[PDB]
Design an enzyme around this catalytic site. Sequence first.
Site, PDB file in Angstrom:
ATOM      1  N   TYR A  83       4.937   9.807   6.305  1.00  0.00           N
ATOM      2  CA  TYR A  83       3.964  10.489   7.307  1.00  0.00           C
ATOM      3  C   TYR A  83       2.650   9.786   7.348  1.00  0.00           C
ATOM      4  CZ  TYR A  83       1.441  14.430   9.147  1.00  0.00           C
ATOM      5  OH  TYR A  83       0.573  15.281  10.198  1.00  0.00           O
ATOM      6  N   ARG A  88      -1.953   9.659  14.127  1.00  0.00           N
ATOM      7  CA  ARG A  88      -1.165  10.801  13.602  1.00  0.00           C
ATOM      8  C   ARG A  88      -1.609  11.960  14.227  1.00  0.00           C
ATOM      9  NH1 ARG A  88      -0.939  11.076   7.118  1.00  0.00           N
ATOM     10  NH2 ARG A  88      -2.710  12.593   7.662  1.00  0.00           N
ATOM     11  N   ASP A  89      -0.682  12.968  14.527  1.00  0.00           N
ATOM     12  CA  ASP A  89      -0.671  14.373  15.046  1.00  0.00           C
ATOM     13  C   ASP A  89      -1.457  14.344  15.970  1.00  0.00           C
ATOM     14  OD1 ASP A  89      -0.527  17.288  14.474  1.00  0.00           O
ATOM     15  OD2 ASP A  89      -2.272  17.214  12.996  1.00  0.00           O
ATOM     16  N   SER A  95      -4.644  17.068  10.954  1.00  0.00           N
ATOM     17  CA  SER A  95      -3.962  16.140  10.132  1.00  0.00           C
ATOM     18  C   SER A  95      -4.085  14.576  10.780  1.00  0.00           C
ATOM     19  CB  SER A  95      -2.467  16.487  10.053  1.00  0.00           C
ATOM     20  OG  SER A  95      -2.534  17.596   8.936  1.00  0.00           O
ATOM     21  N   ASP A 135       6.343  16.073  13.359  1.00  0.00           N
ATOM     22  CA  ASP A 135       5.788  16.225  14.657  1.00  0.00           C
ATOM     23  C   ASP A 135       5.704  15.228  15.761  1.00  0.00           C
ATOM     24  OD1 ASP A 135       5.050  18.642  13.432  1.00  0.00           O
ATOM     25  OD2 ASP A 135       2.983  17.908  13.052  1.00  0.00           O
ATOM     26  N   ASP A 313      -2.698  23.374   5.925  1.00  0.00           N
ATOM     27  CA  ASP A 313      -2.225  22.668   7.129  1.00  0.00           C
ATOM     28  C   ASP A 313      -3.588  22.126   7.786  1.00  0.00           C
ATOM     29  OD1 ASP A 313       0.520  23.351   6.775  1.00  0.00           O
ATOM     30  OD2 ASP A 313      -0.253  25.593   7.414  1.00  0.00           O
TER      31      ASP A 313
HETATM   32  O1  LIG Z   1       4.926  23.224  13.800  1.00  0.00           O
HETATM   33  C1  LIG Z   1       3.754  22.597  12.925  1.00  0.00           C
HETATM   34  C2  LIG Z   1       3.276  21.811  14.067  1.00  0.00           C
HETATM   35  O2  LIG Z   1       3.304  22.388  15.180  1.00  0.00           O
HETATM   36  C3  LIG Z   1       2.396  21.757  16.179  1.00  0.00           C
HETATM   37  O3  LIG Z   1       2.167  22.665  17.491  1.00  0.00           O
HETATM   38  C4  LIG Z   1       3.515  23.268  18.255  1.00  0.00           C
HETATM   39  C5  LIG Z   1       3.938  24.440  17.601  1.00  0.00           C
HETATM   40  O4  LIG Z   1       4.512  24.221  16.449  1.00  0.00           O
HETATM   41  C6  LIG Z   1       4.903  25.337  18.442  1.00  0.00           C
HETATM   42  O5  LIG Z   1       5.069  26.341  18.176  1.00  0.00           O
HETATM   43  C7  LIG Z   1       4.436  25.203  19.868  1.00  0.00           C
HETATM   44  O6  LIG Z   1       3.448  25.719  20.279  1.00  0.00           O
HETATM   45  O7  LIG Z   1       4.102  23.640  20.492  1.00  0.00           O
HETATM   46  C8  LIG Z   1       2.985  22.997  19.614  1.00  0.00           C
HETATM   47  C9  LIG Z   1       2.965  21.552  19.807  1.00  0.00           C
HETATM   48  O8  LIG Z   1       2.018  21.341  21.043  1.00  0.00           O
HETATM   49  C10 LIG Z   1       1.170  21.227  15.969  1.00  0.00           C
HETATM   50  O9  LIG Z   1       0.962  20.311  16.954  1.00  0.00           O
HETATM   51  C11 LIG Z   1       1.301  20.313  14.690  1.00  0.00           C
HETATM   52  O10 LIG Z   1      -0.007  19.894  14.167  1.00  0.00           O
HETATM   53  C12 LIG Z   1       2.002  21.012  13.414  1.00  0.00           C
HETATM   54  O11 LIG Z   1       2.219  20.320  12.505  1.00  0.00           O
HETATM   55  O1  LIG Z   2       1.075  19.286   2.674  1.00  0.00           O
HETATM   56  C1  LIG Z   2       2.030  18.320   2.906  1.00  0.00           C
HETATM   57  C2  LIG Z   2       1.227  17.527   4.220  1.00  0.00           C
HETATM   58  O2  LIG Z   2       0.678  18.352   5.085  1.00  0.00           O
HETATM   59  C3  LIG Z   2      -0.186  17.949   6.041  1.00  0.00           C
HETATM   60  O3  LIG Z   2      -0.652  18.912   7.021  1.00  0.00           O
HETATM   61  C4  LIG Z   2      -1.208  17.205   5.482  1.00  0.00           C
HETATM   62  O4  LIG Z   2      -1.951  16.628   6.829  1.00  0.00           O
HETATM   63  C5  LIG Z   2      -0.739  15.976   4.671  1.00  0.00           C
HETATM   64  O5  LIG Z   2      -1.901  15.282   4.013  1.00  0.00           O
HETATM   65  C6  LIG Z   2       0.178  16.570   3.664  1.00  0.00           C
HETATM   66  O6  LIG Z   2       1.097  15.593   2.892  1.00  0.00           O
END
Ligand SMILES: OC[C@H]1O[C@@H](O[C@H]2[C@H](O)[C@@H](O)[C@@H](O)O[C@@H]2CO)[C@H](O)[C@@H](O)[C@@H]1O
Ligand SMILES: OC[C@H]1O[C@@H](O)[C@H](O)[C@@H](O)[C@@H]1O
Length: 358
Positions: A83, A88-89, A95, A135, A313
Site C-alpha cells: 500500500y 495513492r488514494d 490516505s 482502492d 481511516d
Molecule cells: O471502501 C473504502 C474506500 O472507499 C472509496 O470510496 C468508494 C466507496 O467505498 C464506495 O462505496 C463508492 O462510494 O465509491 C467510492 C469511490 O469513489 C474511497 O475512495 C477510498 O478512499 C476508501 O478507502
Molecule cells: O490502517 C491500515 C491502513 O489504513 C489506511 O487508511 C492508512 O492510510 C494506512 O496508513 C494504514 O496502514
Amino acid sequence: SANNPWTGFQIFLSPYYANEVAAAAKQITDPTLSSKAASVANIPTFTWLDSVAKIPDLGTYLASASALGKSTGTKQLVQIVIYDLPDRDCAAKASNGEFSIANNGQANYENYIDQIVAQIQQFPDVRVVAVIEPDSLANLVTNLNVQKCANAKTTYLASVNYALTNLAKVGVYMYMDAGHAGWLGWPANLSPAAQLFTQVWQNAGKSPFIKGLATNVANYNALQAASPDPITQGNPNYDEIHYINALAPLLQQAGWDATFIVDQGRSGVQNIRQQWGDWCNIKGAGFGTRPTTNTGSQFIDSIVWVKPGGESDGTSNSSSPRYDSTCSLPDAAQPAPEAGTWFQAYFQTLVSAANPPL
Ligand SMILES: OC[C@H]1O[C@@H](O[C@H]2[C@H](O)[C@@H](O)[C@@H](O)O[C@@H]2CO)[C@H](O)[C@@H](O)[C@@H]1O
Ligand SMILES: OC[C@H]1O[C@@H](O)[C@H](O)[C@@H](O)[C@@H]1O
C-alpha cells in the site's frame, strides 16, 4: 480451488497490531471489556506496508515467523498489504502517501517493491499472503473522470504490474484489491472490473501466485446480509457474497479461476451508514466474523481481517492536507485522527460491539 494459501499453515499474528492492542486494552476501564479487547491481539490480521519505513518491520516478521515455525514444528504464514502507490488514494484525500508521481514516484515504488522482495527472498520457509494496493484498481474501473486518477492510471498499472511480477518471483500469494459490493459489485460495473483485473493478471503472466481478489478491505459490508442494508438500493448485489458470486464467473470465462478473500474486521454492526459511500470511521462499527477458511462459498478462500480495526481511516481536522469531508459526515466518528494512526475510542467501540462477541 486445490491450493488455498492458508491450508497447512499457522498464521503469524501481527506484532504491530498486537502492540497497539495491548496498549489499547490497558486503557479500557471495564475489566471484562479490557480482557476481551486484549484477546484481539490473538486474532490474525494483515499488517500494512504503508510506507518504506515499514519494510524493516516485514523483515522482523518473516524472521520471527521462520523461527516460530521451527520451534513449534509448523509452517508460518505472514499476512501483508502492499500500500504505497505514487499518488495513492486518487479519489479521496485521507490516505495520500509519501510517494507522488511528480517526485520520482514510480521509480521510488519500484525500489519499495525491490526491498520487500529482498526481505521475502531470505525466508522461503515462510509463506506470505499479500493484498495488492487497496482502492487502486477499483478507482481505475469507475473513477477515470477524476483527474488525479486519470493522471495516475499508467503509473498505477505499471506499479501494480511491477509488484505482481516481482512478488511472484519469491512465491508470494497475492489477492488484488477489488473494492466491494457497493463499488464494483453493481451489475453494470462487474464486466468493466473483470476486464481490467483479467488484463492485469495477463500482464503479470497469469502467475499461479495471483490467486484472485480481495473485497471489502477497510469497508463494512456484510458478507451475507440477513436483510439488504437500505443503502444498497438499486444494486441486487447488496453484500459481498452477491458481488463475488456475480464477478467470479466472468473471471473464469476469461481464463482465470480466481478466488477471493473478504475483509470482515469492521462488519460486526450493520446499518451504521446513511449512504453506502460513507467509508470513513463509521460510528458504531464492531469487529465482525473472525478469520476462517470455512467461508461457505466456492469462490472464497478466507474471511480475513485486512483493515486493522482501531486504525483511523482519515482525519476529521479540516485544516490537515489530508482532510476528506467523508470523514465529517453525521455517521463518521469525530474527532478522528490521521489515517493509519490509532483511534482509541473507535477501537473500544469495535470491541464492545463485536459480533460475534469477543
Ligand atoms: O471502501 C473504502 C474506500 O472507499 C472509496 O470510496 C468508494 C466507496 O467505498 C464506495 O462505496 C463508492 O462510494 O465509491 C467510492 C469511490 O469513489 C474511497 O475512495 C477510498 O478512499 C476508501 O478507502
Ligand atoms: O490502517 C491500515 C491502513 O489504513 C489506511 O487508511 C492508512 O492510510 C494506512 O496508513 C494504514 O496502514
